[PDB]
Amino acid sequence: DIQTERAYQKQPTIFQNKKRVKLPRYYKNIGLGFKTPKEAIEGTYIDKKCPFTGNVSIRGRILSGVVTKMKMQRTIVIRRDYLHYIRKYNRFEKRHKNMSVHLSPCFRDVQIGDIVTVGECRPLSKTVRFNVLKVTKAAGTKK
Amino acid sequence: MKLNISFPATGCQKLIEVDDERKLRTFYEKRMATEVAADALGEEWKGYVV
Amino acid sequence: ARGPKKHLKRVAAPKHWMLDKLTGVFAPRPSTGPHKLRECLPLIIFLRNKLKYALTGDEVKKICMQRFIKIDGKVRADITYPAGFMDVISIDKTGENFRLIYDTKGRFAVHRITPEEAKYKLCKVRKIFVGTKGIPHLVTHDARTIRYPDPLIKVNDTIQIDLETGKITDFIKFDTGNLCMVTGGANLGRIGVITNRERHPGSFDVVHVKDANGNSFATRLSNIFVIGKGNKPWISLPRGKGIRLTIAEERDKRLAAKQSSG
Amino acid sequence: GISRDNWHKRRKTGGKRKPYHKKRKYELGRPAANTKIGPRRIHTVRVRGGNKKYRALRLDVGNFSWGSECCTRKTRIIDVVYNASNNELVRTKTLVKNCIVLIDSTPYRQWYESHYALPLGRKKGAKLTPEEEEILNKKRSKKIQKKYDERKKNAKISSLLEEQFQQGKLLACIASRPGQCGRADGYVLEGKELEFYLRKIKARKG
Amino acid sequence: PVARSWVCRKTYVTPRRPFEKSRLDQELKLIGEYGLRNKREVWRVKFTLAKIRKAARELLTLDE
RNA sequence: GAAACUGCGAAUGGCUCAUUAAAUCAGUUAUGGUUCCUUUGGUCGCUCGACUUGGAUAACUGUGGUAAUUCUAGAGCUAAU
RNA sequence: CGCACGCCCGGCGGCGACGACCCAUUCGAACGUCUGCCCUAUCAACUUUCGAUGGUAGUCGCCGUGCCUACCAUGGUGACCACGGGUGACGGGGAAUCAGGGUUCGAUUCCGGAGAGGGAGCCUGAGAAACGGCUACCACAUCCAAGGAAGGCAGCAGGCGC
C-alpha cells in the first residue's frame, strides 16, 4: 500500500520503536489561514514535499491557476491566464504561463478544471517551486 | 669539471679544477649525498672522504 | 565583480549627503560599521561639508588622528566611520556635542545637544534571542548585542542605553499613541503619534502616524522609531519639530523672513 | 572541472541554452569519496569560506544507537549487506548514508546484562565459567536487588533482535554522510523497519 | 570617468521656411529698431518667449 | 635605519562590447535553502583532568655554474606574532 | 608587543597594540519567485532510453535542486508562435525628433553583465576558474654559444595595418 520504493518510507521526525508493556503522525498548520486538511492528519501516506506532513515552508507568493494535466507522479500542470497590455494600441492581448506544481496525495480527488491556490516554497525539482495548498471544485461539479 | 670543496668545522672553501679522467672515473654512477673517499683524488687528499 | 567593492562614485553616493558634482569622480565609501553604507553619514562628510571645520580629506585626517572626535563615548580614528541615526558625536577640545537625527526633509541635520543629554541614546531593538544557557539577548539598530535585558522588552520597542556602561535604563513600548520619528521612505524625518498598526501575515506591516497639525501618513513598520511615550520625546528635536509643511508654506515663511529683513 | 550548474542542460521546453559565461568556481564539484571498510583513513578537503570537510576513504568503527532504550555505543562495522540506490555499492562495499551494515553486538549485550542483570544471546547450556559475568548477574544487597527485580519486568526483547544478538551481529542504518563528516554514525534496525529490510535482503539474495 | 558636466543646450530655433518675405521683413524691423547683430539674437528671444508661453499653457490647462 | 623573514593588499580601480534573445537586464519578493576578510558589539578563571619549551631558515659571510632572465646550487652564523 | 609606573613586608595592579572557535552586525556574493524583449513560417511541430518531465534513496556542493549516479514512471513545450534561424543585438537609466499618438537610436563616463589572442585546467586566499597568477594545447611571435630562455596594450602614451 505504502513502502513501494526500495528504501523504507517513514516521517523521519516521529520514532516508531518505543517499547511498551496506532502509529503517531507529524503535521503542521502552514500559516496564512490555511486549514490543515483532514487527510493530512488521518492519512497513512508518506511525503517529503507535502506542506502539511513534510519538510517544506510556504513563503513569498500565493498564486492560483486551473488544473490542466494530472499525468505525472505527485505533480500537476496548472494554467495561469492574464491580459498583457500593449501601449501603442490602447488594448490588451490574452497570454498564458503553465507551471509544473507539486500535488500532495493529501488532496485525494482533484479534477482537471478545478481551481487551485499555490504557495511558493524552495525548489522541489528542476521546474517545480510551488505547492497546492487548497482546491476549489470547478463551477458546480456536484453531479 | 671543477670541484667546489668546503670544510664545515673550519668554515673555509675553495674551487679546485680537475683535468685527470681516472680521478673522476670513480664518482660516476653515484647519487647525491653519498660519502666517497678522496684518497684517490691526490696524495694530499689521503684518508679523506667527501 | 570577483570580490567586495571598495570605490563609490560621487553620482552613486546617497543623495542626503548633498555632494556637488564638479569636485571629483569619487565620494568616501564608508568603512563597514554599525549602520548601513546607504543610511550613515561618514565622519569626513559631517566634519568637512557640514561643520566646515576642515577643507580637505587630509585636514579631516589631521583632526581625527589627534583623538579629538568621540562617537558614542569611544574615540574613532577612521575618517570614513559610518555615524548614523541617534549617534552622539562629542568633540571635547571645542566643547560641543551633536546627535545625528534627521531634518524634516530626507537628510541629517546638525543638532547640538547639552553635556548631560550627550551621555545616553535611544536604540530600536531589532531581534530578541536566547543564548547558550537560556541567557536572553537583544540586538539593536546600531548592531549592539545587550544580554540580560528587562524580560518585557520585545522586537519593536525603544531602549535608552548609557554610553559608558552600555546597559538598559528605561524603555518605550511600541503601542498606539506613542511618538515615532520615521527613519526611511518618502516620510523621512516626519515626527508623529502612532494612530494604527495594520497586520499583513507574510508582507510588510504598514503603520499609520498622525502629525501634530492633523496630517495622516502611513509607513512600513521597519522605517519607524518610537522616540517618546505620549507627546513627550525622550530626546531634543531640531527646529521645525518634524512637521514637513508644504512648499507653498515654506515659500511664505522664507519671503516673510526676507521682507522682514528688508 | 566537474561542473555543478543548470545552464549546461536543456530548458523546460526542450530548447538549448548557449552558455553566456565560462565555468565559475562556486559551480564546483569533486570526485566521490567511495568510503570502503578498513583501517581508519581520513583526508581533509579545504572548502568555500576556508572551512574543512573530512573525506573518510576507509572506516572500521562507528557510533551506532539502539533507539528503543537510548543505548548508543561505538562498535566495529564488519560488512555491508543491502543498499537501496545501487547494488554495485554492495559488491565494492561502499559506506554511504542510509545503507544497511552489520555491527558487533558485544557492547549492547554487555550493557543489557549489566543493566537488567539478565543474559542476552548466550545459548542454552552456556558455560559462564569466568563467573564475573555471574558477578554482573548476581550478588547484591536487599533494596538494590528490589530496584533490579523492578526493572527486569520490561526487558522483553523482540525475537527479531534476540536472534541477531545470539548470531553475534546486528543490522544498522548509516544516518550520517561518511564521505563529508568522516563518521559512520547510525541506528540499529528494529520493528517494521527490520521486517521490511530482512524481507528485502532475503528476496534479493534468493 | 571624469569630474565634468556635459550639460549644454541650444538657446534658439531656426524657422521652418527659410525664405518667407513677411518673416524676413518682420525680423529686420526688430534688428534695425533695437540694433541686434544678426537674426539669431531675434530667434533667441522668440525661443525664450515660446518656452514661457508653453509653461503658461501647460499650467492653464490644469483645473483651478 | 637599508636589506630580509612575517602580516596585509594585489579579486578593487581602469579598458573594450566579441559573446549572449526569458539569456543578460529592469521592477518585485525569497534564503524558514547558503557562504562571508574587514568593521561595530557580545563572548573568551563556564571545562575537575611555566619567572617562558623545541630545531630550522633568510638578510649577512664566503665558494660557484651557463651565452642568457626578477635562474639560482653549495658551506658556515643567527632571530619570530 | 608597547607606553605609564605603581600600591607594603623578598609583598603588589591601570591604559593600549596584536591574536582567536562561536554569535549577531556591516560589505556583499550566490541560487530562486512573479511580469516584461527586435526580425523571421522559403522555421509546424520539438525534447528522450548516452537526462528529455516527474518519483524514491544516495553522490557531490557553501547550500535547494536531474547537478550527477542507480532503479522506476511516460512525461515537458506548442498557433496565446514552441523548436530552428538572423541581428551592423551586451541590457537598463537614457538620446534625437516631436500638436496628441508615435518612429528611430542607446559601443560611449551611472548601475548590472561578460572578456583579457582561442579554448581548457588549476594553485593561493574570506573572495579568482584571476590572466600587469601559474600549467598545457591551437594561432602568432622575441632572444639564442642551437643546448635552451622568455611571451600576452580590449591599462596610460605611442608604432604598423585597417
XYZ file of N, CA and C in Angstrom, chain D residues 39-135:
291
model
N 41.111 -0.118 7.915
C 41.722 0.706 8.964
C 41.510 2.204 8.699
N 41.233 2.986 9.753
C 40.781 4.403 9.655
C 41.727 5.186 8.737
N 41.162 5.820 7.706
C 41.874 6.695 6.740
C 40.943 7.851 6.358
N 41.313 9.082 6.730
C 40.505 10.319 6.512
C 41.419 11.406 5.933
N 41.134 11.855 4.704
C 41.760 13.038 4.052
C 40.862 14.261 4.268
N 41.462 15.453 4.346
C 40.778 16.747 4.616
C 40.688 17.552 3.315
N 39.503 18.098 3.016
C 39.223 18.963 1.830
C 38.903 20.373 2.341
N 39.728 21.358 1.973
C 39.531 22.795 2.305
C 38.504 23.369 1.321
N 37.386 23.898 1.836
C 36.176 24.277 1.044
C 35.907 25.782 1.192
N 34.904 26.285 0.460
C 34.496 27.718 0.385
C 34.340 28.299 1.797
N 34.901 29.492 2.024
C 34.936 30.182 3.330
C 36.105 29.744 4.204
N 37.008 28.906 3.677
C 38.177 28.369 4.401
C 37.798 27.366 5.481
N 36.617 26.744 5.374
C 36.129 25.690 6.304
C 36.719 24.345 5.863
N 36.567 23.306 6.692
C 37.097 21.938 6.436
C 35.941 20.971 6.164
N 36.263 19.831 5.549
C 35.304 18.790 5.093
C 36.065 17.466 4.956
N 35.798 16.506 5.846
C 36.623 15.287 6.057
C 36.131 14.161 5.140
N 37.030 13.639 4.298
C 36.778 12.508 3.362
C 37.220 11.198 4.021
N 36.284 10.459 4.624
C 36.511 9.072 5.098
C 36.634 8.161 3.875
N 37.847 7.672 3.609
C 38.173 6.771 2.471
C 38.182 5.313 2.953
N 38.484 5.083 4.238
C 38.304 3.784 4.945
C 37.829 4.046 6.382
N 36.933 3.198 6.902
C 36.416 3.257 8.300
C 36.206 1.838 8.846
N 36.491 1.636 10.138
C 36.270 0.363 10.882
C 35.191 0.575 11.953
N 35.343 1.603 12.799
C 34.430 1.892 13.949
C 33.206 2.675 13.449
N 32.257 2.951 14.351
C 31.050 3.760 14.086
C 30.183 3.908 15.327
N 29.591 5.091 15.531
C 28.733 5.427 16.702
C 27.279 5.063 16.375
N 26.863 3.842 16.721
C 25.502 3.295 16.476
C 24.673 3.383 17.761
N 23.346 3.471 17.606
C 22.357 3.719 18.688
C 21.230 2.679 18.640
N 21.109 1.862 19.691
C 19.896 1.051 19.987
C 18.815 2.005 20.517
N 17.872 2.391 19.651
C 16.971 3.545 19.841
C 15.906 3.325 20.905
N 15.438 2.084 21.083
C 14.269 1.724 21.934
C 14.536 2.006 23.422
N 15.804 2.041 23.854
C 16.200 2.298 25.271
C 17.396 3.263 25.373
N 17.704 4.026 24.314
C 18.749 5.089 24.289
C 20.117 4.521 24.700
N 20.499 3.373 24.130
C 21.814 2.703 24.331
C 22.651 2.858 23.057
N 23.437 3.937 22.972
C 24.389 4.214 21.861
C 25.806 3.860 22.327
N 26.535 3.091 21.512
C 27.934 2.660 21.770
C 28.734 2.718 20.466
N 30.011 3.094 20.555
C 30.997 2.943 19.454
C 31.271 1.446 19.267
N 30.866 0.892 18.120
C 31.063 -0.531 17.738
C 31.996 -0.594 16.524
N 32.193 -1.796 15.977
C 33.088 -2.095 14.830
C 32.233 -2.617 13.667
N 32.094 -1.828 12.593
C 31.461 -2.257 11.307
C 32.257 -3.455 10.774
N 31.560 -4.511 10.336
C 32.178 -5.760 9.789
C 31.997 -5.794 8.264
N 30.789 -5.516 7.752
C 30.475 -5.584 6.297
C 29.144 -4.880 5.994
N 28.796 -4.814 4.702
C 27.533 -4.242 4.145
C 26.757 -5.383 3.470
N 25.419 -5.315 3.486
C 24.507 -6.403 3.013
C 23.609 -5.903 1.869
N 22.987 -4.725 2.010
C 21.953 -4.192 1.081
C 22.040 -2.663 1.012
N 21.952 -2.113 -0.206
C 21.873 -0.653 -0.489
C 20.703 -0.412 -1.452
N 19.867 0.588 -1.151
C 18.570 0.858 -1.819
C 18.792 1.475 -3.206
N 19.782 2.362 -3.342
C 20.107 3.095 -4.596
C 20.665 2.129 -5.648
N 21.832 1.535 -5.374
C 22.618 0.722 -6.344
C 23.242 -0.487 -5.635
N 23.442 -1.583 -6.377
C 23.865 -2.913 -5.855
C 25.332 -3.211 -6.208
N 26.001 -2.333 -6.968
C 27.481 -2.331 -7.142
C 28.121 -1.659 -5.919
N 27.368 -0.792 -5.229
C 27.750 -0.176 -3.927
C 27.701 -1.228 -2.805
N 27.078 -2.392 -3.044
C 27.173 -3.610 -2.178
C 28.428 -4.406 -2.567
N 28.635 -4.672 -3.865
C 29.732 -5.546 -4.375
C 31.087 -4.959 -3.960
N 31.368 -3.717 -4.369
C 32.534 -2.908 -3.921
C 32.119 -2.164 -2.646
N 31.799 -2.920 -1.586
C 31.010 -2.489 -0.394
C 31.427 -1.079 0.051
N 30.785 -0.061 -0.534
C 30.941 1.375 -0.182
C 30.035 1.703 1.010
N 30.535 2.515 1.946
C 29.750 3.117 3.056
C 29.215 4.475 2.588
N 27.911 4.544 2.300
C 27.159 5.800 2.004
C 26.039 5.924 3.044
N 25.425 7.106 3.154
C 24.282 7.362 4.073
C 23.119 6.439 3.688
N 22.473 5.835 4.689
C 21.208 5.059 4.563
C 21.468 3.749 3.800
N 22.633 3.126 4.024
C 22.972 1.742 3.588
C 22.945 0.823 4.815
N 22.519 -0.430 4.638
C 22.352 -1.425 5.740
C 23.698 -2.125 5.967
N 24.255 -1.989 7.176
C 25.541 -2.612 7.616
C 25.244 -3.594 8.754
N 26.152 -4.548 8.981
C 26.190 -5.412 10.191
C 27.254 -4.855 11.147
N 26.960 -4.829 12.452
C 27.857 -4.279 13.516
C 28.047 -5.332 14.613
N 29.059 -5.139 15.463
C 29.396 -6.048 16.591
C 28.373 -5.806 17.710
N 27.651 -6.855 18.124
C 26.542 -6.801 19.116
C 27.073 -6.786 20.560
N 28.398 -6.829 20.751
C 29.066 -7.098 22.058
C 28.885 -5.942 23.049
N 28.956 -4.636 22.676
C 28.780 -3.563 23.659
C 27.318 -3.404 24.110
N 26.366 -3.765 23.242
C 24.902 -3.749 23.512
C 24.553 -4.880 24.484
N 25.093 -6.079 24.235
C 24.953 -7.275 25.111
C 25.531 -6.960 26.497
N 26.746 -6.400 26.548
C 27.474 -6.070 27.805
C 26.646 -5.089 28.644
N 26.085 -4.047 28.016
C 25.188 -3.061 28.678
C 23.914 -3.771 29.157
N 23.255 -4.527 28.268
C 21.973 -5.242 28.523
C 22.102 -6.091 29.793
N 23.174 -6.887 29.874
C 23.474 -7.798 31.013
C 23.721 -6.982 32.286
N 24.518 -5.913 32.199
C 24.934 -5.074 33.355
C 23.793 -4.156 33.824
N 22.770 -3.926 32.989
C 21.604 -3.045 33.284
C 20.457 -3.868 33.884
N 20.039 -4.940 33.200
C 18.878 -5.798 33.571
C 19.295 -6.915 34.541
N 20.587 -7.275 34.579
C 21.146 -8.442 35.308
C 20.595 -9.749 34.718
N 20.264 -9.750 33.417
C 19.717 -10.914 32.666
C 20.646 -11.248 31.501
N 20.726 -12.528 31.068
C 21.561 -12.911 29.928
C 20.894 -12.614 28.575
N 21.680 -12.142 27.598
C 21.252 -11.910 26.190
C 22.171 -12.698 25.251
N 21.597 -13.296 24.201
C 22.262 -14.312 23.363
C 22.549 -15.559 24.179
N 23.836 -15.844 24.426
C 24.361 -16.867 25.377
C 23.425 -18.084 25.411
N 23.640 -19.005 24.465
C 22.719 -20.114 24.078
C 22.542 -21.061 25.270
N 21.387 -21.732 25.361
C 21.040 -22.667 26.469
C 22.184 -23.671 26.661
N 22.664 -23.812 27.901
C 23.876 -24.578 28.252
C 25.140 -23.760 28.041
N 25.071 -22.441 28.271
C 26.217 -21.502 28.198
C 27.065 -21.658 29.463
N 28.325 -22.074 29.307
C 29.295 -22.240 30.421
C 29.850 -20.854 30.769
N 29.272 -20.221 31.798
C 29.556 -18.825 32.233
C 30.682 -18.867 33.279
N 31.764 -19.590 32.962
C 32.781 -20.117 33.916
C 33.782 -19.053 34.369
N 34.062 -17.959 33.613
C 34.834 -16.844 34.172
C 34.150 -16.268 35.425
N 32.809 -16.251 35.434
C 31.930 -16.077 36.628
C 32.035 -14.655 37.210
N 32.678 -13.709 36.509
C 32.499 -12.247 36.735
C 31.293 -11.775 35.911
N 30.835 -12.594 34.958
C 29.509 -12.459 34.294
C 28.428 -12.792 35.328
N 28.685 -13.802 36.169
C 27.814 -14.198 37.309
C 27.844 -13.104 38.390
N 28.968 -12.386 38.557
C 29.066 -11.171 39.430
C 28.098 -10.100 38.906
